[PDB]
Amino acid sequence: LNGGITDMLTELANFEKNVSQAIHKYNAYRKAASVIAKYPHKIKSGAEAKKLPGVGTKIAEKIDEFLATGKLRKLEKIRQDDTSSSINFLTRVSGIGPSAARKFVDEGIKTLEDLRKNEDKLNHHQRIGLKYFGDFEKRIPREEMLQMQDIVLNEVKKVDSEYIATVCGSFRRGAESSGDMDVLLTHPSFTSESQPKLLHQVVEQLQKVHFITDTLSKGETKFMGVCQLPSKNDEKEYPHRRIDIRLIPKDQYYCGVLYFTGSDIFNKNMRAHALEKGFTINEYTIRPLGVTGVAGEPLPVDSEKDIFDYIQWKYREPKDRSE
DNA sequence: CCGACGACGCATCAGC
DNA sequence: GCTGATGCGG
DNA sequence: GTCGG
Numbered sequence: 001l002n003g004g005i006t007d008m009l010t011e012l013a014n015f016e017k018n019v020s021q022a023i024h025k026y027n028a029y030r031k032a033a034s035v036i037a038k039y040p041h042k043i044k045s046g047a048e049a050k051k052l053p054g055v056g057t058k059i060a061e062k063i064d065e066f067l068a069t070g071k072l073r074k075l076e077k078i079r080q081d082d083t084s085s086s087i088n089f090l091t092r093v094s095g096i097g098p099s100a101a102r103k104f105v106d107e108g109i110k111t112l113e114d115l116r117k118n119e120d121k122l123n124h125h126q127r128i129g130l131k132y133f134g135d136f137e138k139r140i141p142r143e144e145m146l147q148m149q150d151i152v153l154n155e156v157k158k159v160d161s162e163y164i165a166t167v168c169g170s171f172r173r174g175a176e177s178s179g180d181m182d183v184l185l186t187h188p189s190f191t192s193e194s195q196p197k198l199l200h201q202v203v204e205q206l207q208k209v210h211f212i213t214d215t216l217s218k219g220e221t222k223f224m225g226v227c228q229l230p231s232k233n234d235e236k237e238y239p240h241r242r243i244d245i246r247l248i249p250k251d252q253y254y255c256g257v258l259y260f261t262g263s264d265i266f267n268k269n270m271r272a273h274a275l276e277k278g279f280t281i282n283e284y285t286i287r288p289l290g291v292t293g294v295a296g297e298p299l300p301v302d303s304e305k306d307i308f309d310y311i312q313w314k315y316r317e318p319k320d321r322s323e
Numbered sequence: 324c325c326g327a328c329g330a331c332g333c334a335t336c337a338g339c
Numbered sequence: 340g341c342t343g344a345t346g347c348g349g
Numbered sequence: 350g351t352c353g354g
Contacts, residue, residue, distance in 0.1 A: 024327080026350095055351085094347090100346080100347085123335075221332070
């Protein structure tokens with residue numbers, strides 16, 4: 001319908017983020033492309049698009065130029081720009097952000113081949129991101145996410161059957177494919193007012209059975225790393241996948257699951273509704289708001305449904321949290 | 324006109 | 340060495 | 350870049 005327009009706007013977003021270091025412009029172009037991508041008519045003019053929330057004067061002017069000519073002069077130019085195209089490309093390496101990509105290109109390091117020749121100048125995260133560059137850009141089919149979940153839940157229970165672990169993200173909402181695996185972990189002994197090896201024990205067990213293959217970062221409450229399904233003796237091996245594991249206090253765990261299940265638009269709507277019912281919900285807690293807007297103490301939450309009950313919402317299955 | 328636009332854990336750097 | 344800032348990813 | 354107080 002409008003794929004030329006939303007492709008144009010996405011590409012402009014990337015250069016704002018990765019080259020100009022203008023994160024809010026990045027998000028403006030992304031929000032514009034989203035609302036256009038949901039529009040169920042083929043756009044005929046910039047004025048037509050400008051009536052949508054998030055499309056302003058300047059993007060309307062760009063849509064007019066694209067509709068009249070089939071391209072955008074500024075985008076054509078920055079595409080052919082060796083310096084800018086190289087900075088934009090190098091941020092596809094996990095661990096290389098706009099600042100690192102700038103530094104590398106400044107000193108003549110422009111391609112993956114150049115990075116491979118300059119391992120010295122890459123930190124540990126960036127080396128992993130380079131090692132799995134192609135794998136990390138592949139999506140994960142749901143059937144593999146199910147096999148990964150099998151392993152995660154089994155090994156967690158093997159460490160301590162009192163752990164609770166939930167794979168969240170779009171997978172939990174039923175998505176047919178995922179970009180990564182997001183695991184939320186808690187244990188009855190870990191509360192907000194309460195051991196600095198609860199997460200370590202679980203990471204270690206997944207390493208011992210050779211599911212987790214690399215570590216990008218690891219502290220007492222957050223692990224970011226790499227995993228891979230076991231290959232079947234003779235079949236081609238599975239791509240390496242990104243997995244995060246977060247340990248959350250038990251009394252904050254279901255607020256955590258709700259939040260990291262999303263979707264992002266659902267979260268906005270749920271918190272909007274919660275505010276107009278006199279509650280403030282964030283990633284950690286739901287708290288009542290007094291008549292002058294002072295937040296009270298966090299309310300007890302022992303399930304996701306508790307959160308819905310507080311705000312007078314019928315329980316919504318993750319499958320039905322698209323918005 | 325002009326400020327908001329998410330907050331935060333972990334790795335690493337800058338400064339002392 | 341320690342403390343705070345920055346980069347980065349989510 | 351867009352929105353809105």
